Amino acid sequence: DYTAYAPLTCYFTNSTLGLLAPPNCSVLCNSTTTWFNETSPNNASCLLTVDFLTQDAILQENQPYNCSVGHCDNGTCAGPPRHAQCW
Amino acid sequence: DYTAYAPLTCYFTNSTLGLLAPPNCSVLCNSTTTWFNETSPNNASCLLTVDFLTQDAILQENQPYNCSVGHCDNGTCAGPPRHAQCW
């Protein structure tokens, strides 16, 4: 395993429009040694809103839900929103 | 662990200028279910060349090495090159 490849694991939301960055276009990542944020690239798909009854998350319900998707614009998620299903 | 975050692990080269995409600006990634390539964003740091005696890699030597770094431009790594150390 000479000069082995460097894995980077980053954490997204699953959706019908693919993996989404958060609304602030900053993704949590982990190298072999560290946890840090990386700014999403401009035009990456990002979560704008999540559209379920707030109490469902308080009850930690493990069910898919309606969400809206935008694109990253200079470190913030921008609309106009598109519909998607998130889980 | 309700609607758990979706991890994506992608594989880079370590360097003194940070994690590098390959010269073709296409990164191997793994979701919880699949292996696939993702195109690097424009202006991501990428490996242009590796500057060691070819036989060293044939001998699978696990040593750091001089490399040159560029930036992704429309799916290919572009110069001008900057020096870095890779491992």
Residue numbers in the entry:
A (entry chain A), B (entry chain A): 18 to 104
What does the paper say about this structure?
To neutralize chemokines, ticks secrete small cysteine-rich chemokine-binding proteins in their saliva with no homologues in mammals, termed Evasins. In contrast to the highly selective Evasin-1, its homologue Evasin-4 binds ∼20 CC-chemokines with nanomolar affinity. Among this broad range of chemokines, the chemokine CC-motif ligand 5 (CCL5, also known as RANTES) is of particular interest, because it is one of the most expressed chemokines by activated platelets and plays a prominent role in the development of atherosclerosis. Thus, Evasin-4 binds to the CCL5 monomer and causes disruption of the CCL5 dimer by shifting the monomer/dimer equilibrium toward the monomeric form of the chemokine and not by direct replacing of CCL5 from the dimer.
Here, we present the crystal structure of Evasin-4 at 1.3 Å resolution, which presents new structural features within the Evasin family members. The overall architecture of the Evasin-4 can be divided into an N- and C-terminal subdomain. Each of the N- and C-terminal subdomains consists of a three-stranded anti-parallel β-sheet core, in which the sheets are oriented orthogonally with respect to each other, forming an L-shaped structure. The 3D fold of Evasin-4 is tightly arranged by four disulfide bonds and contains a rigid protein core. Three disulfide bonds connect β-strands within a subdomain (Cys27–Cys46 connects β1 and β3, Cys63–Cys94 links β5 and β7, and Cys84–Cys103 connects β6 and β8), whereas the fourth disulfide bond (Cys42–Cys89) joins the N-terminal subdomain with the β6-strand of the C-terminal subdomain. Superposition of all six polypeptide chains of the three Evasin-4 crystal forms showed that the rigid Evasin-4 protein core is flanked by two more flexible protrusions. Residues Glu1–Glu15 are unresolved in all three crystal forms as a result of high flexibility. The crystal packing reveals a large intermolecular interface of 2,380 Å2 buried surface area common to all three Evasin-4 crystal forms. This interface involves the N-terminal region of Evasin-4 that forms an extended intermolecular antiparallel β-sheet, predominantly involving strand β1 next to strands β3 and β4 of each molecule. Thus, one can conclude that Evasin-4 is a functional monomer, whereas the observed dimer interactions in the crystal structure are a result of crystal packing.
